[PDB]
Design a protein around this ligand. Structure first.
Ligand SMILES: [Cs+]
Ligand SMILES: [Cs+]
Ligand SMILES: [Cs+]
Ligand SMILES: [Cs+]
Ligand SMILES: [Cs+]
Ligand SMILES: [Cs+]
Ligand SMILES: [Cs+]
Ligand SMILES: [Cs+]
Ligand SMILES: [Cs+]
Ligand SMILES: [Cs+]
Ligand SMILES: [Cs+]
Ligand SMILES: [Cs+]
Lengths: 178, 178
């Protein structure tokens, strides 16, 4: 258990940190490449501008945690239990996030380039400023999520679930004039 | 002036009928191929299942007239003054109708295949059952018009003006789930 402490510029590479429990641990610029972090549990922690390359995070829990600015490259992120996790400014490009429940999660200015979010639950999520080029949102649930008009012409949306507002914004994003 | 009379299966081909005035003239199955009908004026008349091939109808006026079932092939239809003209079941495929004001006109089960309706005013029009394959509705005004979901994936709509309902139906026609 790492409780009420910080870690800055620490190199945790290729370590086995499975089942780690943290509470109010603030990590800044820590390197978690090749780290095995399966079955870990986090509550109130922050992983700020950290590097997650090929990090294994599946079967984990993050509650009220921040991931602001962190970069995730080819990470195993499913399944995963998230409750109010801030992904603002984070880089999730190219990862497979299919099926993850991301209700009300902040993804402001998050990079979602070529990220697979198929069937993801994004109700009430905030995607203001996210980069969605090549993003796959098929069969995902977006109702009440705040999204920019650019998303409507960048992500694939077959079967995506939306509210009236989004449908209207989709329509205007494809050249119709309201 | 042809007033309160009928004409059935009449052959009017290649006749000069320019400036003709009719009032409650009922034409059924009349052939108007190659006919010049420019500057004509019609009020309360019917042109039912008539044939209009290469007929010249520009600079004309039709008020409360019916065109039910008539076939129009390469006709000059612009400009034109229409007020409540019924085009139900009519064949307007391939004609250039650009810019025509068609407010509240019925186009139920009308064939609009490859018809150019760019910039047309179709407010309050009824297009239930129209066939819109290759139809061009760019910069046209559709607000309050009743249209089938199939129109949203068949006609070109760049800049078309729509209300909230149509935008929503456009959205659902492209795979989004409301
Ligand atoms: Cs361990
Ligand atoms: Cs802090
Ligand atoms: Cs949860
Ligand atoms: Cs969640
Ligand atoms: Cs916003
Ligand atoms: Cs911003
Ligand atoms: Cs004449
Ligand atoms: Cs009649
Ligand atoms: Cs008129
Ligand atoms: Cs009109
Ligand atoms: Cs209808
Ligand atoms: Cs019908």
């Amino acid at each position: 258990q790492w409780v009420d402490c910080e870690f800055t510029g620490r190199d945790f590479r290729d370590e086995d940190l499975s089942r780690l429990h943290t509470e109010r641990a603030m990590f800044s610029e820590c390197d978690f490449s090749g780290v095995n972090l399966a079955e870990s549990q986090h509550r109130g922690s922050a992983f700020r501008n950290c590097t997650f390359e090929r990090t294994t995070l599946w079967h984990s829990t993050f509650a009220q945690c921040s991931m602001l600015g962190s970069v995730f490259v080819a990470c195993r992120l499913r399944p995963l239990t998230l409750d109010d996790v801030d992904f603002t400014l984070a880089v999730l490009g190219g990862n497979d996030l299919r099926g993850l429940n991301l209700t009300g999660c902040r993804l402001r200015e998050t990079s979602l380039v070529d990220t697979d979010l198929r069937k993801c639950v994004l109700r009430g999520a905030d995607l203001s400023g996210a980069r969605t080029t090549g993003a796959r949102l098929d069969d995902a649930d977006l109702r009440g999520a705040t999204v920019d008009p650019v998303l409507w012409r960048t992500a694939s949306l077959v079967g995506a679930r939306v509210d009236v507002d989004q449908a209207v914004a989709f329509a205007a994003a494809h050249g119709l004039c309201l």
